[PDB]
Design a protein around this ligand. Sequence first.
Ligand SMILES: [Zn+2]
Length: 82
Amino acid sequence: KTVGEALKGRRERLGMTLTELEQRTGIKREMLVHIENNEFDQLPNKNYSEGFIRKYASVVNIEPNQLIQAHQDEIPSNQAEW
Ligand SMILES: [Zn+2]
């Protein structure tokens, strides 16, 4: 599975709507759907990809670091170079 499928799957098993997840995470539904679909290039700031995944994961009781590690080649890391 992709990271977005892992997250969405968990959300659906919890019976949690996107509306609820936006409330709990503070991440707008558009961006939550982009994450669920691995559409990281559609985030205004792609550097936030990991942080968005982390907040999602924490709300749905997925341990974030090991999720990120298992999917690291999918996830744009924070390009905080300069
Ligand atoms: Zn968009």
